[PDB]
From a paper:
Here we describe the characterization of Designed Ankyrin Repeat Proteins (DARPins) that were selected as tight binders against all folded domains of p63. For the initial development of DARPins as tools to study the p53 protein family we have focused on p63.
The tetramerization domain of p63 differs from the oligomerization domain of p53 by the presence of a second α-helix per monomer that reaches across the tetramerization interface and thus stabilizes the tetramer. DARPins were generated against the complete tetramerization domain including the second α-helix. After initial selection screens, the identified DARPin 8F1 was further characterized by ITC measurements showing a KD value of 54 nM. Because these two hinge regions are part of the tetramerization interface this structure predicted that only tetrameric but not dimeric conformations of p63 should interact with this DARPin. As expected, the DARPin did not bind to the stable dimeric isoforms TAp63α, TA*p63α, and GTAp63α but did bind to the tetrameric isoforms TAp63γ and ΔNp63α. Intriguingly, our findings thus demonstrated that DARPin 8F1 represents a conformation-specific binder for tetrameric p63 isoforms. For the TD and the SAM domain, the high selectivity of the p63-only binding DARPins 8F1 and A5 was confirmed.
Residue numbers in the entry:
A (entry chain F): 2 to 126
B (entry chain E): 1 to 126
C (entry chain C): 359 to 402
D (entry chain A): 359 to 406
E (entry chain B): 360 to 407
F (entry chain D): 360 to 402
The structure:
Amino acid sequence: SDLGKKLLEAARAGQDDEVRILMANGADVNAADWLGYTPLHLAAWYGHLEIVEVLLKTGADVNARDAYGITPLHLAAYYGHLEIVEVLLKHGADVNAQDKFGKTPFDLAIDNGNEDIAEVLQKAA
Amino acid sequence: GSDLGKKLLEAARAGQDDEVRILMANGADVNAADWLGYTPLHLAAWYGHLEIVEVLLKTGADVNARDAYGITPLHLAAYYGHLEIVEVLLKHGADVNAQDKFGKTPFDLAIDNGNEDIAEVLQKAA
Amino acid sequence: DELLYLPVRGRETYEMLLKIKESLELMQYLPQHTIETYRQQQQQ
Amino acid sequence: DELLYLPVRGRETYEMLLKIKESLELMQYLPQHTIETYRQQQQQQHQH
Amino acid sequence: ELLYLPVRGRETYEMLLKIKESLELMQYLPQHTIETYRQQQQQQHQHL
Amino acid sequence: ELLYLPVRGRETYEMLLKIKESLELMQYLPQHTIETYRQQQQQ
């Protein structure tokens, strides 16, 4: 929607208070862009911990897939956001999720030298 | 300017024996080439016009002229199965070892197209 | 498995075919509905 | 960046060029992590 | 027969121009050229 | 220089095959032949 598209942008940009307002206003927490990126995907990708938290509290799908089979946990692992990895894990993120290239979050963590995140994902495997 | 060369290329392709003789008495370039390097002799050998092959060779046509893919008259006579033209080109010094840009001799094109009689003639011509 | 191998003569032709292969292969992962939406703006 | 016009003779050649053009255009819009993962999976195969 | 393809970018344009003209050029190539090329392709693919 | 392109998918393969053939056949032509062809088309 309009609200959906504004939630995707607010979540990407890390506009905490704009996200809360958009959601009191009935913005779809699982609104998806043309590749299937949800607000939760973009907040995980760009490292906005408080936004990840409000989205999960408001019913964001923790294991939403983009068109290339990417999950929020993949993005938090790839882009080195350890706290977001631990929050997504605690909310039921699929540690063994494979994207359409066969990569797990663990694999993207290793590919980007994020060894801390790889260890947390391995111990959660 | 002159379309004599163009008209000789067409006459040799079309097998217009008399038209070829007229065009050359009128001073038409026996070694005129189209944009791919096809000469009258190329086209006559390709399309199996024996008497035109004969008059062109008599008038100074280059028997080993190359198109842009390194094809010679002997290649075309072999590919398209014109045995008597192969024999005439051989007698007038056609290069039996000529390779096109794909590494093919006239013999190779004869074999590739099941013209085994021509292949044998070419193999003996050595 | 399932990978076909295309022989190419020349670096320039290769690099051209590589760029196109990448774009086409990445596009192949998309559902029809995704690709069709983009094409709407093209038909305008 | 610059918008340019390619003249094409023939529907079949056109349709082929359209598909390639739109694959290349659409690729610019794919996130780095998708493109990068694709490319490394290509190298992690060429190794085999 | 005449269709215009809009293209964004010089590099994409030049690439599509080269391909268009290779495809258009092929219509004018003799059978013996095309056929010899294709057989040499198969006579390689079997070797490797 | 003989190089091998790995390809996933029949449709992508057939498209790349058609383009490869057309480009490889054009590559054999000298520049002056390509130039002459272009001029003759423009007329």
